[PDB]
């Protein structure tokens, strides 16, 4: 009996390692991204002011003031908001600031959140969608709210479009996490031909916003300066040029000052007084709001309750039921239907945009997505 | 309508990270651990020699020579052998070296491998079990073959027990992997009262084995020196004392020299000529060997074929079917039964030991474990 | 003898413990060097010079008196400047603060001097002049790297400036972004995209080049589509093609009439005029880190250079030499060594509180777009080098 | 101008690429420091001295003339020497090469001098003398750490030697292993196990102490069971108990008649005689890194010590000071600093090729078991310190 003196094949990539080897809720804040998007509304008084003004230059100031304000609550809000489930809605009615705002998570890959806002007196519509495109930039993560933001001043037959600056989270790997916001922002008034430029200057000039307003002719009509953590000012351009808390240039005009976060704040995730109301519920509101409102979302619920262990268990559950829901539509050939926004041309730029489908505030909700 | 000014719970371990965040076959050699255990037999001629000798001192030399030889093929065998499945058997009959050896993987937690060897002329039995207890020691892994090894010389009414030294794999994290073997080894001849001490010296004196033989009275009768990678020698103790490849002390006696690895070797995982036969099959052997022989194990099969991708897929499958098999017995209250070894007193030490159940070489296999 | 330690042990249940795990893990993490094994034997300062490969297009434009016909050559140069990128998944060495690279070609009619002008952020400034005194090509590149998913982006932040001296006119543009797909997991492939505007600041002529992204099914891979328009926004040319291969030009009105992945063939619109075609890579290419012949010249040295060039020149950079000589084992040790000499120099300059001095470039506004830029400080081609920094 | 690089690019498909990933990853990995956050404000040289807490047992044995009755006191000392381990899941600082620790207690009748005598392997040598000139307690400890599963083992390799000078007799033993269960995942708990043989080399008396392991359901946790036997292997005593609390002794024949987890109560076999009982930890304990009162004295300092003690003494160790003062944030920076000063000293001694000199200990055989050991070189209590190494 004769045996073999050699092996058949002589002795001799990441695939093997990949095949054979979520986010911690301790890094979230108790807010859906949709709710973090409604903080855009924190200073809706500027919109209402804008609508009551005759001169479009003065009107562009308040919209410029408002655009800065809608991204102003983010200082020290280093908690990531929960990525909204597909079909997650969120509504907010505020009787004092005079608006209603429905938002719906439209897609999940990529994550797109659609929102529609209306003044209660029918003076404005505010709408758009946001994809927060996350990019690891060095030792920091960038979030970039991709998407146009459209504000229609109904009493004035005009609409303003713009996009938001980039929101950067530094020291994400090491050090005290902190928020920067930089980018340039053009506000086009599509009736007048008026343009407003807002540079959110990057860091010294921390939080520094500088910019100007010009007519369609391209004549500057005022400069705009301040910090998105505090305030914006308008001033005559000629004296702003010569003259480069906050440095108050002579004869400037206060356009906006940040709303109030409570002394309780740094114990409550640095939420504003506006933010503290976002995720609240009560027996009345339970009957009316739909089953997709993120006020009925157990993990944000349980985290706001302190039950963090129950929050991370509940979070992984929804995400899993959401994959599973995707794979059944992946096979059953059904494809997802957006209850409250449909897709369509933005008429002021011709760029695809999500468009409110109507009928939300009628209630009588029917066949809603069962996403919890 | 009045809203809330604070959250219910103020804002505020590894569990979350653990719950919400195999071995690569590229690190194995194509051998079951059971097969790597049969390399103990590579020099069974020393056993047969031992059995033909009248003087037990001379007999203790050959058993000491054999004990060193059974762990000598491990130099440069830096490939881990596949952890044997529960129920994996392995048989080897060699007509020239004169033995049969059945081994069976007895348990999996911990991994215990049982083996029984018999000389074909009924001159010896060689048996024991091995648990290779792995410990990460610094920049190296230690494997320690826990368990007694019992060699019975049937023509001489005697039995020797001993345990194996520790097998250390250096530079496991960084550098060229390489094998060291260290430890002290006592060989007790239980009839004569004779003892043989083998120190496997740790590293300079790389692979250095030194030791002695003494009677029950505790009189040294010879020294024993050499290297487990090459050879062992006996020499008069009096001249070994005075006198401290290999340093040949005057008037020494060659007890053993390592068997032959082929020039092909370093292309074939550094297997010996003995090792190259272990995992071989053929149409004859297929009819006879049981369904648990690791010659019928697909991943060791496919890896020996070079099909490494198919090997790592096939490996994870068996391990998974093995967990699944465990969890069904975890519920169905069935518990695993060892086909060929039962547990019992080692009579020469009173220490629990696995004991051959008989009947293996009768074939007529019945109801064997379906482990592939 | 005391009954207590001066301060109780600090608690694990309180989350104050992992922010010191945070502090110590990152002091270790940022220490680590990127393995030479993902680099290619090129300093970014050298990768920057490949812009110049097709300088014959600047010379073409220098000698055309139709402004738009000059624009068609600058756009040709803009597209060609980024063409060598295809299949260049090696990451050129980040240049050490103080690194220079000079390249003189007489067959091509230019001489170029680059300096690594800052290390955080890593900014490369370059200045190239025509030898017939017919252009200045100058600017700066800050490669902003961004990871996500499987992809790495490098956005080259910076204004690039072609001044055609014989026409008293100057073009500015900003290059497209370069994506590298399937890092770690899969086969690497290179994509370039982003809108490039080229402006003739004299005439008001605007070139729009949209480097189209892959899109679904990989259909628009490498496609480049755009126009040239006059100061009043009327299209005079359509431009199209792939930036890996060719740029065509054609009547705008007819272009409107016609409106690891593999690229699509260029459909040659009737009446097109080829502006630029790539010179194919040598058969050395896929074995030679996918260099073009031009790229294989950059780190070449003779002792006739080593006397003339300054000591800072990256042709004298050891780790890039080690890697090119195949000694990749040494190259990560040379890399390790240089990245610590540079730390030590800069911390040393903090205990001393001295500001670092760029030898060949200074800061100043771009007079064409008001951006802050980097401007040649002169005297580089004098030789007479003095007090240069010791960086190797 | 060359047409190729001097050497083709080396391939990823060939597995020659990851062994340079291997080379570079480990040069980074072994650099990293263990976070101070798992340590406790004690040098191992100090953790070593806690053996001495119950020296009153040596003094008991020094003054007994029945040899076996002396054995019952050495075994009492052996068990007591390892008692403070319970709930000590902080890992004492690995002592720097050159570290010493001295401890003088007159209330306890001993004076001890330890030196860290090698860094790889980390070997601690110690020598303690009775002040009444009645014993020498000396030996060395190499803590061989071994990880697997959730558990870390520290096997203290070394021979420990009690010479009772008034009886011309000497005991040798080797301590048990100390397991730490549920590292990272779960609550840490400490277990000691291993067979300890104590030999009276004069009389031939053997003490066997089996520190029993936990076993299934945690039933034998901390139990210690053994006997004392004469030179002809006859049991004169059974010993039993838990090493956390007590050691009893009893007629051997009656003991045979009786043959995070919580421990079991000690069943007090009729006719037992208590040999040793632990002194309970203070209520400070669980807040004070679970020190016993003795352990809380070790790093204590007065300026009256800092003049007398040498500069190497670990009471003068900064990172251990930082940690004890609560400044744990600084302690990992002091740790970082010291572990690199020590590397730099030893590599420096390689460029110079000089061998390191232990000041207070030298190597030599143990005359009792032939093992190689560490032996006091004298002169430590003279003071008159000279040329000591600068290690802080
Ligand atoms: C095709 C088109 C591409 C689709 C692009 C999707 C990008 C992800 C969007 C998501 O916001 O960014 C993930 C990224 O995570 C983390 O590392 C981020 C790490 C750095 C985070 C920075 C923290 C500081 C931020 C604080 C202030 C910033 C405010 C704005 C933040 C809002 C962002 C949403 C968020 O975390 P996450 O909770 O949303 O987790 C998802 C989710 O869970 C989903 O569920 C998946 O998909 P699926 O598996 O359920 O289908 C998952 O996995 P995968 O499938 O994508 O592989 C998983 O990535
Ligand atoms: C209760 C009583 C305790 C039980 C003690 C078991 C120890 C594991 C024995 C095994 O040999 O060591 C594992 C350890 O792995 C690796 O990292 C080792 C890393 C360092 C390896 C060193 C490489 C150099 C060695 C070369 C020369 C040495 C020759 C001797 C080696 C033979 C050792 C078997 C081997 O690899 P492996 O292929 O056997 O993988 C198992 C297996 O797969 C099983 O299947 C499991 O259990 P299960 O999940 O299937 O039930 C798995 O996981 P787990 O359950 O234990 O958590 C998984 O550890
Ligand atoms: C004061 C406040 C400053 C605030 C910081 C913000 C901006 C800083 C910009 C740099 C951040 C980059 C991340 C870390 C990384 O290492 O950057 C590397 C990148 O590889 C990373 O490891 C990769 C990590 C794992 C996963 C990704 C793998 C990427 C594979 C590349 C594919 C090929 C792409 C090629 C395409 C074409 C490129 C134009 C650059 O290659 P690089 O080898 O040459 O390394 C330099 C330098 O050489 C020196 O080491 C530095 O600094 P320093 O060491 O002197 O201090 C370094 O890092 P850092 O210290 O800044 O973090 C380092 O950037
Ligand atoms: C020439 C050939 C040499 C061949 C080497 C073989 C033998 C070497 C022995 C050392 C190997 C240990 C592994 C690495 C580790 O770091 O050891 C640490 C251990 O923590 C590891 O990180 C842990 C890694 C992750 C997982 C395990 C976590 C363990 C938690 C501990 C729990 C508490 C247990 C306490 C119980 C009582 C103890 C008696 C000792 O604590 P340590 O802080 O004081 O660090 C020293 C020293 O201080 C200096 O740093 C050294 O050497 P070096 O830096 O001067 O060169 C160091 O490592 P290394 O270089 O040898 O690898 C280091 O051992």
Numbering used by the authors:
A (entry chain B), B (entry chain B): 531 to 542, 549 to 557, 565 to 746, 751 to 791, 823 to 950
C (entry chain A), D (entry chain A): 533 to 791, 818 to 950
According to the publication:
Members of the OSBP/ORP family vary in length: the short ORPs contain primarily a conserved OSBP-related domain (ORD) that can bind and transfer lipids such as sterols, PIPs or phosphatidylserine (PS), whereas the long ones often possess additional functional domains for ligand binding and/or membrane targeting. The OSBPL1A gene (homo sapiens) encodes two proteins: the long isoform ORP1L (residues 1–950) containing the ANK (ankyrin repeat) domain, the PH (Pleckstrin homology) domain, the FFAT (diphenylalanine in an acidic tract) motif and the ORD, and a short isoform ORP1S (residues 514–950) containing only the ORD. Here, while we cannot rule out its cholesterol sensor function, our structural, biochemical and cell biological data suggest that ORP1L is a bona fide cholesterol transporter. Here, our results suggest that ORP1 is a unique sensor of lysosomal PI-bisphosphates, and that PI(4,5)P2/PI(3,4)P2 allosterically regulates cholesterol transport by ORP1.
